[PDB]
Each structure stands twice: as structure tokens, then as C-alpha cells.
Amino acid sequence: SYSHVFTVTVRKATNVTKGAIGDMLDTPDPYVELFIPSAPDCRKRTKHFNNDVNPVWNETFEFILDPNQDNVLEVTLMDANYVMDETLGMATFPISSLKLGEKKEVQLTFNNVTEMTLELSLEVCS
Amino acid sequence: SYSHVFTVTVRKATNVTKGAIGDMLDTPDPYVELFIPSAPDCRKRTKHFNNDVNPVWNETFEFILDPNQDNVLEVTLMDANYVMDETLGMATFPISSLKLGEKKEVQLTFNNVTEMTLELSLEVCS
Ligand SMILES: [Ca+2]
Ligand SMILES: [Ca+2]
Ligand SMILES: [Ca+2]
Ligand SMILES: [Ca+2]
Ligand SMILES: [Ca+2]
Ligand SMILES: [Ca+2]
Ligand SMILES: [Mg+2]
């Protein structure tokens, strides 16, 4: 049964970059995408901001999790385009590291120089 | 005598622009400069953020004011460069519109499309 509520708040990122050459062509237009393969709603995403290497989203998402399935959070940092969007990086979070009732601020890192702040919590359905 | 403490918190700006052509050449690298000609320290400024059209500064400044002088706040939105920095816009605030003990959130506008959030307060010296 799916009985665990996994809340993810994507707060902000700092120094988003496509690389030296990539940034010269196009200032990153970042959004974040959240993916849990084991969850019933697999994929979610934040809005994008144009031309902002330190975007602030403060968007909150809720997943419904099965405690008996392997649940892993995939966080993808994206650059929006008119053409096809570009994947800048990906970081994973083992949700099995959290414990019920726990709320935690997690900082992820992309391409060594980019950081992202998340706030993760886990509760029962009620 | 200088006996009024005028506190200014520059919080953030949204959609900073140098214009259509200017933005294509250079994504704004914004900072804010504060100027009160009648104050003993005339000029102050925030740090800049590279390539960020929605910068967040949250920097607090303190001016000392003479209640018998005309005190007007000049807010200049700047773009940082290696060369000479460029002036994007200027907005004024009559400090004689504030009351002692009053604390107020003010939103300024530059070039019709750029907004800036300030937090202004006025107290007497302790
Ligand atoms: Ca651009
Ligand atoms: Ca861009
Ligand atoms: Ca883009
Ligand atoms: Ca640039
Ligand atoms: Ca720039
Ligand atoms: Ca600049
Ligand atoms: Mg920003």
C-alpha cells in the first residue's frame, strides 16, 4: 500500500552553469524536475526563470510512497529552451535515509560548482 | 543636529533589463546604489550578482539624518562591468513621507518593466 507522504520543497539554486562556452551562448534559464520511479505520479517540475543563474522557486511537491518499494529521488537541473531543453545535471537522494516525522534541509551539487537547496520531509498518510 | 536613523533594506529586484539589444550582449549583473545628498555618508551600495535578472541582496544600510534638512533617497539600479558600470535607472523616495517608528515595504519601478522591493524604517537615535 502507498501510505508514506514524501514532501519536497525546491527552494533555490546558486551559480547554475552550462559551462564556460555554454554560458556565453545562453544564460541558463533554469527549472528543476523531480522523478521517483516507484511513485504513482512519476514526474514533476518547477517553473523556469529566464536568465537567472541563482533562481529562487520555493515550490512544494508531494509524492505518495510505498514503504516496501525502493524509493529513490532523482533531481534534474534543467535549462529551458524554445527548441529542446538541456539537461545540466542530475543528483539522487535515497529516501530510505529519512525517517518519519523528520524534516531536513538538503544541499545538492551539480557540475562541482552549482548548488541547490531542498527541504525534504516524510510523514504517514493519516 | 543629526538625530534620525533611516534604515534601508534592499531586498530584491525582478526582471532587471538593459533593454532588448543590451540583454543580448550582456545579461545584467545588478547591484543597487543608495544616495542621500543631505546625509553625512552620501553613498552606499550592495554587492553585485553576475548574470541574474532577479537578484536577491537582503542587505541593510543605515543613514543618519537631519530632520531640518530636505532628505531625499536616490536609488540607482546598476549593472556591473569590467569596464565602466552602467546606469540602468534611478528612482527617488521622499523620506519626509515616513513617520517615526513606521516600517514600510516599498516597491520601486525602473524602465516600466523592472521592479525592486525595499523595506524602509525611521527611528530616532537611541
Ligand atoms: Ca540569453
Ligand atoms: Ca537564456
Ligand atoms: Ca536556455
Ligand atoms: Ca553574460
Ligand atoms: Ca553579464
Ligand atoms: Ca554587466
Ligand atoms: Mg536570482
Residue numbers in the entry:
A (entry chain B), B (entry chain A): 15 to 140
Anything the authors wrote about it?
Cytosolic PLA2α (cPLA2α), a Group IV mammalian PLA2 family member, preferentially releases arachidonic acid from PLs in a cytosolic Ca2+-concentration-dependent manner. Arachidonic acid generated by cPLA2α is a precursor of pro-inflammatory eicosanoids, including certain prostaglandins and leukotrienes. Mechanistically, the membrane translocation of cPLA2α is driven primarily by its N–terminal C2-domain rather than its catalytic domain. Complexation of two Ca2+ ions by the C2-domain neutralizes several Asp residues, facilitating protein docking and penetration into the membrane interface region.
